[PDB]
Write a protein that binds this ligand. Structure first.
Ligand SMILES: [Zn+2]
Length: 668
């Protein structure tokens, strides 16, 4: 008897070794571990009358190959070991599957339940097996019951889903290859040096967004306004109140403050109310990335990778989802009972106490009807490495928080009417009455104020106060989380790809990490400006989202993949035309960028001068400065030197402006 000898079997293709193992244990109490080409795979002789072999793909086994040089109109699937030397290790997975496929009765794609898994399984079965004998397992968690359920409900492959993923891969590859070679070729022909440059259908509009926002930030000048704070003596309290009215000119604010001193104020309304602070909804992937970035500093790409690992451990549901809902087809009770039998037992006892034993998900807005929100399966976490445990604990507490109870806050608002004036201002304080979910998803601080006890009709006096200057503020620099939110909001990429695009931008050195903020490098800056200057259509956020909408329509059967491919060729042909025209200037710009041809540098940076010895950005900085100073003068009456000092001292002031300002203060 040969343990690993089998015939007349269905071949089940899984994406990862852990998923293959999980599927084997779902199908048999004694699955057989085999090894060939140094790859572990599983034989199921036990399940019903049929036999099964479960093999991991390890990831993509196929990649796109096209023409060399520029332009590239074609993209065809080839084994990755043949076309990508960083992927020759996959050859052994390719060999195993090809060997097991010849003697197979049929094929089951059990890759992950997203578009990538549909493509991976399709390419493998189509090329190594028989596509006409192909079925799809669609599961959202690697629990025995979810796997068995999907095995029982095996369906045809979803060719519309497959075509949507193929279309996105081919269109992404075609745009990246063509634009990146067009850039490198224009430099080779103009400076005779070859440097590696990259571009992407989503990377490039993303880099342009960041560069444009960094320019705007670097040209920002805080403008002044004035606020009035008053001190109200009423009963035993001394209340510092910031008045809700703002003033452009300092004289209007002084006027306003002085007519309030020594006036009487009367409590004319008291409002005591209990406010709800709703328990959170279960994570979709973006929400998880956002929260794990804020709390632990884990990058979006790593959050997704870690969540995928936890799903492969059977600990959470599949994390590539937009949904913030848990439908009734998911047993909350089973999850809760699982967590009760784990290190989360005491947290579950607390949720039981908070709810009385009634566990109701606070359903979020976003849906994804085939892909529920991220939640724990109820299987017990054990021995989790550090970053894994942080992510699992986030997901578990978010879920447990979502089935607990809304928090309650007591609010008291006093309305105070000034004597002789049509003006009334408020004093308010909030206290936590019931913490509830705040003790479960304990990552949300609630500001509490010391109580203030006043009755309707109580009177006091405004005894003192101050006019205070308030400087306008720049839009914040991007964080990874903040950039990721912009991508989601603009519908660039998918929630599965956005985190990787951000990481690819850093790896290829167009972006860099300055603390929590992600800023351009010089190279990223130049590439963004070049793409902006010469190829605005390919970095237009609206047109990128347009393409995203067409890709989404392939999934529904509403548009043909072949039609999106044709339309993309049309777009490439338009890029080709624009490239022939501008190629020499594109190459010249790239040359200046890397110091390859000497330029007359700006007085304050390395960019090429534009006017007055200033680059285009420092020149705009000066224009903005002159106008901002005028606004400062009209509003504050400060003299020139003092306005400059106040702009120079504010960290809101862009660096281009700050260069100009420091110069003018150094002048004589
Ligand atoms: Zn400059």
């Amino acid at each position: 008897m040969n343990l690993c000898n089998v015939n007349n079997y269905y071949l089940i293709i899984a994406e990862k070794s852990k998923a293959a193992k999980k599927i084997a244990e779902a199908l048999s109490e004694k699955p057989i571990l085999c090894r060939k080409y140094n790859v572990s795979y599983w034989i199921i002789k036990d399940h019903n009358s049929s036999k099964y072999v479960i093999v991991p793909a390890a990831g993509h086994l196929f990649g796109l190959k096209g023409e060399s040089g520029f332009p590239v109109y074609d993209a065809d699937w080839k084994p990755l070991w043949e076309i990508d030397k960083n992927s020759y290790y996959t050859k052994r997975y390719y060999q195993l599957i090809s060997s097991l496929s010849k003697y197979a009765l049929g094929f089951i794609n059990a890759c992950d339940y997203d578009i990538e898994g549909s493509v991976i399984g399709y390419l493998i079965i189509k090329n190594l097996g028989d596509i006409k004998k192909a079925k799809r397992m669609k599961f959202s968690a690697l629990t025995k019951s979810d796997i068995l359920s999907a095995f029982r409900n095996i369906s045809a492959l979803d060719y519309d889903m497959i075509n949507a993923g193929i279309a996105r891969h081919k269109i992404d590859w075609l745009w990246g290859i063509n634009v990146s070679r067009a850039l490198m070729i224009s430099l080779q022909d103009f400076a005779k040096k070859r440097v590696i440059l990259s571009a992407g259908r989503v990377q490039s509009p993303t880099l342009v967004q960041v560069v444009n926002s960094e320019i705007e930030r670097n040209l920002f000048i805080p403008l002044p306004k004035f606020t009035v704070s008053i001190i109200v003596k009423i009963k035993d309290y001394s209340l510092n109140i910031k008045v809700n009215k703002e003033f452009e000119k300092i004289t209007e604010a002084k006027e306003f403050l002085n007519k309030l001193i020594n006036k009487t104020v009367k409590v004319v309304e008291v409002e005591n109310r209990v406010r709800l602070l709703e328990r959170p909804s279960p994570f979709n992937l973006t929400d998880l990335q956002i929260e794990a970035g804020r709390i632990y500093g884990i990058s979006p790409y790593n959050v997704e990778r870690i969540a995928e690992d936890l799903y492969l451990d059977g600990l959470i549901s599949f994390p590539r989802t937009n949904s913030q809902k848990i439908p009734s087809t998911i047993s909350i009770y089973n999850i809760i009972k699982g967590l009760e039998n784990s290190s989360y037992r005491k947290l579950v006892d607390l949720v039981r106490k908070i709810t009385g034993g009634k566990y109701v998900v606070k359903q979020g807005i976003k849906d994804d009807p085939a892909h529920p929100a991220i939640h724990p399966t109820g299987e017990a976490p054990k021995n989790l490495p550090n970053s894994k445990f942080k992510i699992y604990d986030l997901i578990a507490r978010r879920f447990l928080g979502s089935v607990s109870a809304d928090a309650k806050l007591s609010n008291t608002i006093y309305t105070l009417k000034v004597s002789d004036f049509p003006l009334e201002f408020t004093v308010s304080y909030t206290k936590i009455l019931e913490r509830n979910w705040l003790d479960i998803y304990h990552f949300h601080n609630v500001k509490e104020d010391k109580p203030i006890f006043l009755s309707k009709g109580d009177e006091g006096k405004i005894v003192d106060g101050k006019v205070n200057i308030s400087l306008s503020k720049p839009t914040s620099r991007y964080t990874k989380v903040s950039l990721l939110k912009w991508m989601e909001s603009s519908n660039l990429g998918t929630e599965a790809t956005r985190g990787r695009i951000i990481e690819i931008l850093v790896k290829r050195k167009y972006l860099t990490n300055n603390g929590r903020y992600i800023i351009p490098t010089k190279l990223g800056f130049y590439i963004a400006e070049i793409l902006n200057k010469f190829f605005p259509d390919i970095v237009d956020v609206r047109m990128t989202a347009d393409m995203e909408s067409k890709l989404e329509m392939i999934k529904t059967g509403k548009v043909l993949e072949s039609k999106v491919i044709k339309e993309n060729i049309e777009k490439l042909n338009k890029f080709i035309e624009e490239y022939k025209v501008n190629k020499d200037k594109v190459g010249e710009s790239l040359a200046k960028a890397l110091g390859l041809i000497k330029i007359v540098k700006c007085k304050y940076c390395d960019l090429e001068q534009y006017k007055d010895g200033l680059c285009k950005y420092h020149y705009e900085a000066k224009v903005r400065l002159l106008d901002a100073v005028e606004i400062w003068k009209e509003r504050t009456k400060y003299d020139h030197k003092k306005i400059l000092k106040r702009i120079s001292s504010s960290k809101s002031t862009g660096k281009y402006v700050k260069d100009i300002v420091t110069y003018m203060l150094s002048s004589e």
